[PDB]
Amino acid sequence: HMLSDEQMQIINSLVEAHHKTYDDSYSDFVRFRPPVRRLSMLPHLADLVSYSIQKVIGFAKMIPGFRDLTAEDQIALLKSSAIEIIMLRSNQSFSLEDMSWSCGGPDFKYCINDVTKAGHTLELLEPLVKFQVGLKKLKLHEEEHVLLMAICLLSPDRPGVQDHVRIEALQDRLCDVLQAYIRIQHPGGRLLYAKMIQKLADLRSLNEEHSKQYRSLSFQPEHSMQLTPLVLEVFGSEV
Amino acid sequence: HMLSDEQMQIINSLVEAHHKTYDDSYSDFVRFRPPVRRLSMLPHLADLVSYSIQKVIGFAKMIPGFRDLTAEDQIALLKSSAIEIIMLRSNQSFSLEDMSWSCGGPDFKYCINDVTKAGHTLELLEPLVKFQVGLKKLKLHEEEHVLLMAICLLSPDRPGVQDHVRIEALQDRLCDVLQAYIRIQHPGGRLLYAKMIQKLADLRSLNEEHSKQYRSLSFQPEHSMQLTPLVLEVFGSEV
């Protein structure tokens, strides 16, 4: 009926980690290869995703429990959840008004048509925009957001995890914290935790769609050369 | 005592290939990751070198004789001569006035101190600036320049070449053309061909110094992630 001391520590630790790794200004984007509007936007998005992966890794490094997993396990979670955590954190920039990620002026405003000049299909971008709208509407607290991210990342059903029991133990402790939080701290959310866990199942389809289309990119050597070594390590299959 | 029809074709083919692959404006540099002044300039230089490698490959594709070599041989020449051809073509941008490559305003003016923020040593940058000055002073015709480049690239003494006899046969035909050219077309160059062949021996030392320092870069995973996949293919040892 009231948040415990250990549940409160987990929330402080996660909120801080997000703040330490999410620049709400998007000021570092001027360091990426400029966007252009033969896969025109692919340089800029690969730099964008590469930068994000580094922030996701820094966040994960601070989820309580994550550091003590084997390095193999840590890599296995990152490699599979990477794109999912990105789509998740990217919701803070998605604007319902124009239905686009707004990270700057005309330059860093990514609308549905630009990601088409990046090797992905207008047709399979449908669920991604849909996902971002339904999540925007969930009006999540920063605590629920950061919590959902850590839960997504700590899924024991990723290819490569060995200690799927410890990772499961970590992920349930984080769900308890979340149910508690919504329950004692989020009025009107009698149905919100289920709505949130539903979003997790959506992300796996997105993750799946992206893997099929990124494989198409990484198998054409003229497109993969536009990727970054981090991107190719993370989304490649060298495990 | 007069250039032959076949020697003239080789010159036309090489001059055109250079023009088709060297933008004297440096206008595409705005597409590279911006220069910054922890290896500050390394993103921009890796993009610069990566772009150059693509122009070198396009030039090589048009050196008569090159296309008919096996793909293994073509790769072997490129992987070893790459940095040398770059230092060679880059002389067109080196300015004796301020002793720096001038490719734009304050942004794309690379002076000796900037390449220091790119993982290389002030101490071993000495021969490179020295090489560029002595070559600038040679006041080479565009024909002698393009010819010197093709000769550098067609050296049969590269690690990996299998048909070191055909590549040697190609490289001598190109030297004949060059000696002829200087002889019947470059007044006052009674000593120039030897001066030019000397520059080739210098490039191997530069090539050597760079390989030792790039290996240091590619062995630190925080610096290699700033490289490009093309750069890592070309200067890596995956043969």
């Binding site: 580094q54 390095a71 990152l78 | 925080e222 290699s224």
Partner: peptide, 10 residues
Amino acid sequence: RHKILHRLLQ
């Protein structure tokens, strides 16, 4: 290989 991922996890 994962050279970079290992580095990035301090």
